[PDB]
Symmetry: C3
Subunit: 495 residues, 3 copies
């Protein structure tokens, strides 16, 4: 029937004919095609967004994504603890919902459960069925979780969860979400998150990185496309004033991004970026900033050195610091804007060679693992595959040495930000001029922007050790200047 | 010629005849039996309370108890280090003798030696003979420790040691201590602790948990007996409006509580509980609770959510905080009260099944290891014995995720207690008043009770993950309210 | 024929003649001798300071010195991080150059390159050629390091570097440096540090500890030799009111001291000591002590309990604490003075017995490893080799128990110092008399000297657990007494 179909659907024809899924019948993935043909457009075929469908001919990539492993140091690692990645989180994000719960990332099959379950998502509404003994279960979101209802309370929770959230945890809304979550789809940015979640059965789909119609490498994330289109020539994935991406737009409803070849920097940047997906405040005007605003589904693709002036180049911030009152950027996982322009990036290395390395599955067949690898934990396949002369110790030595040097500056950045913050509050009480407290607000704004980036970022400098050193020394520098002048004012008050 | 004795010791007759300890001559465990008959009861037989008699017949329980293990991470682990179980100890407990030293617990054979030598015990009077190189020595207290004498001074120590303290470190005084440490025996609660220590040759006797005459499961601790006797139907060890304790009293002098079935929850709540074995202060009068008072040898047998009310009820608190003056409860190792009502306790699982798992000896009869275990360190016997589907990685994952989540809240609640103490110092200097300060001081009590319980308790929430989260979020919420009504009042002044 | 040489070089003959080296011709280690012979004394021979030559007949000492090792925890471990050796470094050293960077030690082969590349040396001017990927490279300094230039800057760096630093990283200047760096040689204390770094291709040479001429155990370190000569009956290496060491003063220009027997406390003592090698400030007048003053190249040879007196007595302190203006001593790695009169010292054990344990070559010859060892990593032959009853884990438990107890005190000293500095600052800002801030400042001095000795020393109390206890408790005491004088003096103002 395929020629019948292609009559009103030529983008699928253009993707699929002469592709590597050429021979796959429209019926392996779309149900009720007959009722579509026989009573027309009105009756849509059913497209069950499902890794198992891809799995039936790609068992390795399917079983590797779903394999359960137990890190014996456990999961749900709060960042905010003394020996954690963000030891002065509570002080430095005072005001922000990340103060309720922010844990370290774990495996991809858990991304839906984990966002819905975290204390900051929806007031603790959603919970693991059977609780802790079932924290390692993978598969279907609502086989794993229960919903204790709209009116349930859990103490020391928050209500950060929103529709745009879901776009970096599932390919489930790919046909039910119009571009940037403007209206006209099943869901949009203004939708109740508690409607949206019951539609989310799967983590990141096979379809997120790989065209089902043609097996092309690709991207579906709306905000990323918006960003690769705002800057096709000078964006972090660009080359020669051009990017290996061509947008296909359906009905003016949705868009995909076929790259002529693999750039896992782009597949991975669909979620491993800094992003605004939340309500905010305006810098100029002080007005709230709403889900009706398209800055609430937004990929800046700026690094640590650029992000402050970007969020000023859009009169956008996330939150006032509960003490200093400074208009702060909330930073999240910028692995893409970090990795950009680094040693490995420069050398043509992409996320997949370190994070999805080659393994012998089947009975003796080669593939890329789709359970993403933590490389310190797999130096032979993550590092020595390329660095042929490296011993496991040397590989580990390198990752940890860079981590050590970076974390040293991260930790000092925090010492100074804590010092600014406390110094600010002493200034206020010693009555210090409110004109100056502004000046200091800008210094906390700067010092925070060049620090929080790196706790938000997951590599402790490995992804870009020069950018991390220039950033974090930047932060230390802004805080000392900020504490200097506050301290200067607090003697002048008394002079 | 037992019936001769039985003629006169009838409670002993009842425990011993038809029992597993039927055939044992009285002489085996008592000496001087002739002068007692021949001279009369003025001349008491000697009762050398000693593991090694039990060891003659029970070698695998004796060996495993005294077996010397070295953990390569060491012990004398101070809980008030940055990466410790209680990193904010010195600040949250200020005024408390625990600020002098509080280590993590080690194995049961060290318990007298570590009680005697701790910096908080008796001004450093008692030290390991030959110093650090003998810190792993097991055996008789005074073979291991030396007495520096009463006039020895050692910097930065405390004098928390009293008689009652020994009641959770050894069986040696079982016949030298009237019920509750009331005046009557060789030692009471008013005895000089320096006379008491010379009488303690062994750690916890075999007879602590086991009747010497018939071998029936028992408790000997006068606190634990007393608590249960009080709350006979509803206490944390009950089932169906009663408790499994057959309570035998000897000469109206002392008592054992005997059980038809092994209940290790009770066997361990002889020591692993919250207690008061110390002087304190009445909440109403400000005046002393000396060792005169029965509240200085007291088991609440209540959990985190009940203890502030319990001790409020019996007009008792432990120390004013050094900054805030809050009438605080000092919390100690409430494992039995935390475990009460958890998923494992509801399964009917007891302390012993995780902490004394089935092992085999030289020949290989199956014994319960009396070298108690750290389950994370032996997940095959402690976990996988019962959870048959768990791998070691799985068992480790289940322990550490739960400790991870719980620790995240413990660290957050310590951040909020320190902020609460810090803003109180400020509110004093900012001239807010006894009324606003007495209310904030009330928020310190509550959030101290709902936190310290958990640094006191040794599971980091494994024993009761739901209780922990309820309590620690409660603590956070209380500190948050406290801080709210300080900084508010701090503006009320200068407005 | 070496007899010509000897006629004008008396003291070389006396070292070489009838030694294990005697037969080795002068031309093995000296070029331009035929030129020296003909063209007079005006043509000084070439003697290249070069481990390769010592190497040629001392294979296994050489190869072990240069052997690549990769610690899987990496290197460049900042000490001022929460989990780290000196968590409160940034607060307690506020106003000293170590706040810019201070990492744990690695291998000797790295000593010059880490000295010149550390952020606190010369404004980030020296960096690894090819960056992090070459950070494990050994051998020649200017093979591994690039000079970025005098004009270049790197943010948040310091300029602590000076020629005297090089005396504890290299032997290369043993024929180029007046005794103690006084004026006369190609390099002296007043030299531009960047001229001196050009001359240093090698770390500590074989000649640091072994006489090239007759292979006698010696020290070549000017300021140690000077320390001893000054206090020859009562210094730390003395027995019987005599040190084992004849000082040989060649041309009145350069001293060495030769050993009758191997004393590694002395040899290792050439670097593993507290020193002054930096400008500071006289206490009596507050006047600078510049490189003109011989106190800028100075070995006290005093333990934690003597240094405060010592620096008062020679009228000198390094820096003012940024907050308290306390006249603070900067401590560095006081290892041999820590070790002096410890249980191991008094038992005649030497540094080399633990740190250069016997291992054997491939050819199968036994030797002392010159890749200096971290005992916890290698207890088999740093410990068990002497303590044969010791299991691997007992050796670890022993090291780690001592470290555990000491760091418990160390962190408490740090908590109380931070309390003192936050109280000194409150106290100031509530306007307590300068006389009573002066009282506070002396306690800060005393607290400080008793605490920072142990963060700079490398063992966390293992080397001398008794001295560490008595010093750190002395610190806590000094701090608490300060905190009390400030809180009482605070209440006095507003009385
Ligand atoms: C023109 C006469 C069509 C033929 C022949 C087929 N399809 Fe179709 N399809 C068509 C329209 C005009 C629309 C949607 C627009 C509307 O408002 O009705 C569709 C929709 C689909 C979809 C769903 C997309 C979504 O929003 O979820 C699918 C998966 C689809 N069609 C598949 C399909 C197949 C497999 C066909 C051959 C058997 C086929 N279509 C025929 C128009 C026409
Ligand atoms: C959005 C749909 C994502 C895409 C595309 C990718 N990742 Fe991701 N990743 C995401 C989440 C939400 C999480 C955490 C899940 C949780 O429940 O906590 C992750 C996790 C990783 C990790 C950690 C791996 C582990 O701990 O077991 C790595 C190393 C990681 N992600 C890397 C990665 C790479 C290299 C990608 C391109 C191939 C990639 N991810 C895609 C969200 C999303
Ligand atoms: C090899 C040169 C790498 C490339 C290319 C990328 N990453 Fe990485 N990443 C690498 C290391 C050595 C580490 C340290 C942590 C570790 O496990 O060893 C990281 C860290 C991450 C993380 C944190 C989780 C983890 O894997 O431990 C994430 C989520 C991650 N990296 C993602 C990521 C993405 C999206 C990349 C392309 C932009 C990327 N990494 C590149 C090694 C390498
Ligand atoms: C060891 C295996 C024992 C044998 C055999 C017997 N007894 Fe014992 N007895 C033993 C201990 C360790 C103790 C101390 C207290 C305790 O409850 O554990 C005792 C105590 C007694 C007492 C004191 C009872 C009282 O009034 O307090 C009596 C009167 C006594 N034991 C008597 C007794 C008789 C008559 C025995 C032979 C029939 C006998 N014991 C055997 C340990 C052991
Ligand atoms: C008082 C007599 C006790 C009774 C009854 C029990 N325990 Fe205990 N325990 C006690 C002390 C004083 C210590 C610390 C000893 C020290 O010197 O530090 C402990 C320790 C434990 C530990 C930790 C063991 C380790 O090697 O670290 C566990 C796991 C433990 N105790 C468990 C336990 C159980 C399960 C009991 C009933 C079965 C029990 N204890 C009884 C004091 C006393
Ligand atoms: C309480 C903290 C205990 C102390 C002190 C000692 N034992 Fe024990 N023992 C205890 C429990 C909870 C159990 C399990 C009982 C069950 O229901 O399975 C045991 C068990 C024994 C046994 C029976 C066989 C076995 O399980 O190993 C014997 C023979 C035994 N214990 C002897 C013994 C001796 C000689 C002791 C002193 C060194 C000793 N026990 C101490 C609890 C406690
Ligand atoms: C398995 C279901 C358990 C039962 C039943 C009990 N405990 Fe436990 N305990 C358990 C874990 C997994 C841990 C954490 C630390 C570890 O070693 O894994 C603990 C911890 C303790 C400690 C701290 C010492 C330690 O082992 O690290 C003590 C002193 C302790 N537990 C006592 C205890 C008592 C008295 C119990 C019955 C009320 C009890 N535990 C039950 C696992 C389990
Ligand atoms: C049988 C003797 C058990 C031993 C020993 C341990 N566990 Fe267990 N556990 C068991 C039962 C019957 C239950 C009730 C729920 C169920 O699985 O049917 C549990 C519960 C847990 C849970 C959930 C805990 C909770 O608070 O909800 C976990 C995570 C768990 N068990 C793990 C575990 C580990 C790691 C153990 C060794 C330290 C362990 N258990 C001992 C049965 C038994
Ligand atoms: C290498 C094993 C050597 C051999 C063989 C000889 N010399 Fe040497 N010499 C050597 C070094 C590394 C140095 C630097 C100083 C030090 O003590 O380590 C020296 C120094 C001299 C000097 C200068 C001494 C002074 O005046 O301060 C002289 C005059 C000297 N050496 C002479 C000498 C002669 C005559 C030898 C053959 C009999 C001879 N040296 C052998 C290294 C080595
Ligand atoms: C012989 C050359 C030794 C080497 C190598 C090490 N130790 Fe030692 N130790 C030794 C002696 C002769 C003594 C004195 C005690 C005696 O009876 O002679 C010691 C002392 C210790 C101690 C007690 C330490 C104290 O501070 O008093 C411990 C805990 C100890 N030693 C452990 C130890 C470890 C772990 C070693 C490797 C790092 C080690 N020692 C080396 C003899 C020798
Ligand atoms: C008749 C009356 C007898 C007989 C035949 C025996 N005992 Fe005793 N015994 C008796 C009294 C009045 C007391 C004193 C109680 C007190 O002073 O508090 C005792 C004491 C003991 C004890 C001492 C308990 C303790 O250690 O303080 C023991 C262990 C004891 N008796 C044992 C014992 C045995 C083994 C007998 C048969 C050989 C025996 N008694 C006979 C009274 C009487
Ligand atoms: C008589 C005069 C002689 C003879 C026969 C030799 N030397 Fe050698 N030497 C001599 C003097 C006066 C000096 C010093 C020059 C000065 O003081 O400025 C030296 C110097 C050396 C050195 C270098 C020391 C340094 O760098 O500071 C070496 C290594 C040395 N002399 C070696 C040497 C050898 C091997 C000889 C026999 C071939 C020899 N000298 C002969 C004076 C005299
Ligand atoms: C300072 C300390 C050092 C330096 C810089 C070098 N060595 Fe080595 N050396 C040292 C000690 C304390 C010892 C042990 C001596 C003893 O136990 O009494 C040694 C030992 C040697 C030996 C003898 C063989 C052995 O015991 O291993 C040789 C041949 C030796 N040392 C040579 C040597 C070389 C060639 C060096 C430069 C690579 C070198 N040492 C450095 C102390 C020190
Ligand atoms: Ca953001
Ligand atoms: Ca208590
Ligand atoms: Ca110094």
């Amino acid at each position: 029937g395929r020629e019948t179909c292609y009559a009103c659907h030529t983008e699928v024809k253009s993707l699929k004919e002469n592709s590597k899924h050429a021979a796959i019948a429209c019926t392996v993935c779309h149900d009720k095609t007959k009722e579509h043909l026989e009573k027309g457009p009105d009756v849509k075929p059913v497209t069950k967004i499902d890794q198992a469908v891809c799995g039936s001919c790609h068992k390795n990539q399917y079983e590797s994504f779903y394999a359960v492993h137990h890190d014996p140091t456990g999961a749900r690692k709060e960042k905010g603890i003394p020996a954690g990645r963000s030891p002065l989180q509570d002080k430095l994000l005072a005001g922000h919902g990340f103060t309720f719960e922010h844990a370290e990332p774990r495996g991809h099959a858990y991304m839906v459960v984990d966002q819905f379950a975290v204390d900051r998502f929806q007031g603790g509404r959603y919970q693991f069925k059977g609780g802790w003994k079932n924290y390692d279960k993978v598969g279907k979101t609502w086989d794993i979780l229960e919903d204790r209802g709209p009116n349930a309370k859990l103490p020391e929770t928050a209500m950060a969860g929103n529709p745009t959230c879901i776009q970096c945890k599932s390919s489930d809304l790919i046909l039910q979400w119009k571009h940037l979550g403007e209206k006209g789809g099943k869901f949009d940015r203004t939708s109740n998150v508690n409607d949206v979640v019951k539609a989310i059965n799967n983590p990141v789909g096979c379809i997120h990185c790989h065209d089902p119609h043609g097996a092309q490498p690709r991207i579906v994330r709306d905000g990323l496309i918006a960003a690769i289109e705002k800057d096709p020539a000078k964006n972090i994935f660009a080359k020669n004033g051009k990017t290996d991406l061509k947008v296909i737009d359906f009905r003016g409803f949705r868009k995909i991004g076929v790259m002529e070849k693999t750039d896992s920097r782009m597949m991975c940047a669909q979620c491993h970026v800094e992003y605004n997906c939340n309500p905010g405040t305006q810098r100029t005007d002080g007005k709230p900033v709403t889900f009706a605003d398209a800055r609430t589904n937004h990929f800046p693709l700026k690094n640590s050195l650029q992000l402050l002036e970007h969020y000023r180049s859009i009169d956008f911030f996330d939150f006032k610091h509960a003490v200093t009152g400074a208009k702060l950027i909330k930073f999240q996982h910028p692995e893409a804007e970090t990795y950009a322009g680094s040693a490995h990036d420069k050398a043509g290395v992409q996320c997949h060679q370190c994070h999805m390395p080659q393994v012998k599955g089947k009975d003796g067949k080669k593939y890329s693992t789709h359970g993403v690898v933590k490389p310190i934990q797999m130096v032979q396949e993550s590092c020595i595959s390329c660095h042929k002369d490296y011993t496991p110790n040397k590989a580990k030595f390198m990752i940890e040495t860079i981590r050590n040097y970076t974390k040293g500056k991260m930790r000092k950045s925090e010492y100074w930000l804590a010092q600014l913050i406390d110094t600010f509050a002493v200034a206020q009480r010693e009555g210090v001029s409110p004109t100056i407290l502004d000046q200091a607000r800008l210094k906390h704004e700067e010092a925070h922007a060049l620090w929080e980036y790196w706790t938000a970022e997951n590599s402790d400098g490995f992804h870009n050790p020069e950018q991390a050193r220039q950033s974090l020394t930047g932060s230390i520098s802004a805080s000392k200047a900020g504490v200097k002048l506050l301290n200067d004012a607090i003697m002048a008050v008394k002079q």
